[PDB]
Design a binder for these strands. Sequence first.
DNA 1: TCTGGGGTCCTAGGACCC
DNA 2: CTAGGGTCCTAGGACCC
Length: 342
Amino acid sequence: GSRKIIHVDMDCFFAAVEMRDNPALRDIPIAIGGSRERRGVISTANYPARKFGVRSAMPTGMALKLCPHLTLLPGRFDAYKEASNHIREIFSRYTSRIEPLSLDEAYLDVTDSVHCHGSATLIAQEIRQTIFNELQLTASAGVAPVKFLAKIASDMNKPNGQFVITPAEVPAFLQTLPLAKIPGVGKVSAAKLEAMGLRTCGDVQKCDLVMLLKRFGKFGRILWERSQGIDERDVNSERLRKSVGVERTMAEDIHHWSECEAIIERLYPELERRLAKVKPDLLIARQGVKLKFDDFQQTTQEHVWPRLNKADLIATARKTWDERRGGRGVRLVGLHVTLLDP
DNA sequence: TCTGGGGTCCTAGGACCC
DNA sequence: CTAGGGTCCTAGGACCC
Ligand SMILES: Nc1ccn([C@H]2C[C@H](O)[C@@H](COP(=O)(O)NP(=O)(O)OP(=O)(O)O)O2)c(=O)n1
Ligand SMILES: [Mg+2]
Ligand SMILES: [Mg+2]
């Protein structure tokens, strides 16, 4: 039969949090990101800032050119994590089939429920209302027979709204639905599709799957599927974090290896703590290092390793710095571990 | 404007053992 | 009648939040 998926997405998450915890903001253009001297980027802006065209992933200086009297906050992640924990707890009250995607997003599966007589509409409605009650903070939601359509639905009545797609409304919805709205279809893909001539799902509904498979491979057949309205993916409930990293971007490029080693030594204790929380004994399936150069090119050097240790990371780093650097300076130094299957 | 810090999933391409 | 060609790694892209 038809499944019942709800996707929930907080509104302007970080900015919403700083707004609630300080309404002295609330009406000024603010953004969470790094400082311009520290070569930072906008993590998120509120609507008064977006008004000036300030977006997430935008370099901070650019956001400042668009909004000089922007109020930039560094971030308070433990609070965001508190809110995430909270809304997840709320999600549980209605179902066990919950797949978190981030601090502020999740998929919920509710096709087997008595909570609103089967009304995904009313359960979503509730969830949002109690998020506003308990957390004093808004939320938007989408409802659909499949994941990606619930994702797309949760945007369509944003902010503090919800939207519901029924199996009856799907082909109508799909005929004029732009490809760039489907998750996983970013600007590169959305360009290749333009050259190919594809803009709506309805355009893909009438092409040749052999072609998409030849020019896109996987996440090419997916497009054909989603355009036909198929997404047989399921809420995972026990999806676990496969990797953990810690990386730092410096205010000035470094050109001395001593600087690099020093930075690795400042970063490792932080890779320690975070690892000592999924595996307090220090797992490792693989470990590795990351260098970003002045020309904004990066390289990662990882390998199979038994257990987390600094010496191997510094060896690998001294080697990555002597073999891939090419006289360049480095803006970013990073540490990284992959984790085991169980 | 001069571009973060976390992560996900795919793929090419090399290297090694058979 | 000095394997080649298949596996399994690593590096990197694209995308997500
Ligand atoms: N590039 C990005 C995008 C998201 N994030 C963080 C900041 C956001 O508050 C949070 C939520 O992701 P998001 O839903 O895409 N953005 P946000 O909730 O602020 O906007 P809306 O969902 O209301 O449109 O992730 C980030 O740090 N870097
Ligand atoms: Mg989001
Ligand atoms: Mg959001």
